[PDB]
């Protein structure tokens, strides 16, 4: 079983996270230090400078030649069992949509791994399980936050064609997009225009206004609009230059010099402190914590803490994990939900209230849940 000293090692690593979150909730709600426009310049700094340098500090120290390949395939099998049962729902049931296929994939299979997940598992099980959580942060930034970006851009590019070309879209040859437009999700006026050719062909051009198609064409429109959203993103330069350095530093034994290693480490020490500070400012700016009713909030904390760790119990036993590697895999599935699935769903308006409960009301009850599996597994 566990000893009473282990309960002090968990509290040593997690009570310093809630202290920086209540000081930011109290300084807006209670004692009123920050104006809501002054409070918007702190979240703008954490999102651009502090956290994309916290993820460089972890990925550049990863050793990609000695990853744990059996643990890392039980994490990539969770997100195929889940993503295939939702495919047998919107293709076989009659009321299945794509607004719910994105939301039920973000709730059940994408937790908060970088800010909360690495200090929590390192205190529960030791310094080897903090080396396994970095291997999961690599696979979310580079695969599962890119597949989810292909779904929001396919959801938006089929609305713009199915609304404006209801009876004609079978004859579209090619679709261009002017470079003024970066997201075609209704925020800009988005005038469209067609070139009628000599034999029933059609050249669609999406423009900026001022006061089904074939799959050889739809897959071309999406890759243009994904590349424009992928180079304006700070987490795609933290993972491009994080992985590229760790492939070189761990083969020829190059150690990064102390001018450059301290120039990065002066801002990334503000990573884990300011991220939890920026997360308590956000739960002070919403009107209520439970912002989606009491039915849709129990639904957000039953996909997250039950259907999560009951589909990595059958995807970790069907691979060959036992002992401690089974216990680390179940506990990291019960982490609260990450923030980047909320950043996407606030922009595209795909249920922004169900994914703002589960980030805020996830964090407040995450600590007596993960300490409830840690007692029950250890028995």
């Amino acid at each position: 079983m566990i000893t009473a000293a282990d309960f002090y090692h968990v509290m040593t690593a997690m009570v310093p996270l809630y202290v920086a979150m209540i000081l930011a909730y109290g300084s807006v709600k209670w004692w009123k230090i920050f104006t809501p426009d002054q409070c918007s310049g702190i979240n703008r700094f954490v999102a651009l400078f502090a956290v994309p340098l916290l993820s460089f500090h972890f990925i550049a120290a990863n050793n990609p030649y000695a990853m744990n390949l059996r643990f890392l395939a039980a994490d990539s099998l969770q997100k195929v069992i889940v993503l295939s049962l939702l495919f047998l729902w919107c293709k076989l049931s009659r009321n299945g949509s794509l607004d719910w296929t994105i939301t039920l994939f973000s709730l059940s299979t994408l937790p908060n791994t970088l800010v909360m997940g690495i200090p929590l598992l390192k205190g529960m099980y030791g310094n080897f399980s903090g080396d396994l959580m970095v291997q999961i942060v690599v696979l979310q930034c580079i695969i599962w936050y890119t597949l989810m970006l292909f779904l929001f851009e396919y959801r938006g590019a089929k609305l713009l064609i199915s609304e404006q070309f209801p009876d004609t879209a079978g004859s579209i040859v090619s679709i261009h997009v002017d470079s003024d437009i970066m997201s075609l999700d209704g925020r800009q006026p988005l005038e469209t225009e067609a070139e009628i050719k000599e034999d029933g062909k059609l050249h669609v051009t999406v423009r900026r206004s001022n006061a089904m198609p074939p799959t050889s064409v739809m897959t071309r429109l999406i890759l243009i609009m994904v590349w424009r959203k992928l180079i304006r993103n700070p987490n795609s330069y933290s993972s491009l230059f994080g992985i590229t350095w760790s492939l070189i530093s761990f083969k020829w034994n190059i150690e990064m010099p102390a001018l450059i290693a301290k120039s990065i480490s002066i801002l990334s020490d503000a990573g884990l402190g300011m991220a939890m500070f920026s997360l308590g400012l956000f739960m002070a700016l919403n009107p209520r914590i439970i912002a989606c009713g009491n039915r849709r909030a129990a639904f957000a904390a039953a996909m997250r803490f039950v259907v999560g760790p009951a589909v990595m119990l059958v995807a970790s036993y069907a691979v060959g994990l036992r002992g401690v590697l089974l216990h680390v895999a179940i506990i990291q599935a019960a982490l609260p939900q990450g923030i980047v699935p909320f950043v996407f769903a606030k922009e595209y308006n795909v249920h922004p209230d169900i994914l703002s409960t589960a980030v805020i009301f996830g964090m407040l009850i995450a600590l007596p849940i993960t300490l409830l599996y840690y007692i029950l597994l250890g028995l």
Partner: nanobody
Amino acid sequence: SQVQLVESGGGLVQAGGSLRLSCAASGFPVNISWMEWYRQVPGKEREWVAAIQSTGSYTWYADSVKGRFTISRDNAKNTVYLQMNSLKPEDTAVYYCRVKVGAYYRGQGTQVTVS
């Protein structure tokens, strides 16, 4: 549905002539009267001319073309005619119609050039 536009009326004329352009629409669903006409020089920054919009009450003309270009609606033949009067020599560019059925459809076939 094999949609197709038919444009005509293009020709070479002097300064002070009279032309009668054409835009014959066919092969459509239920159309709304929002057809247009504009210019496209070999340079950039094109300029819009006229409108034959919903009720025929107000027509969005430009500044220099107000009170001199007659636009006309014919919903029977589904063809909007743009009658030009006192044709200024700066009309060498291409003119074409922009019928709107929710998304603007247009062609390219004219011969408008004023000498």
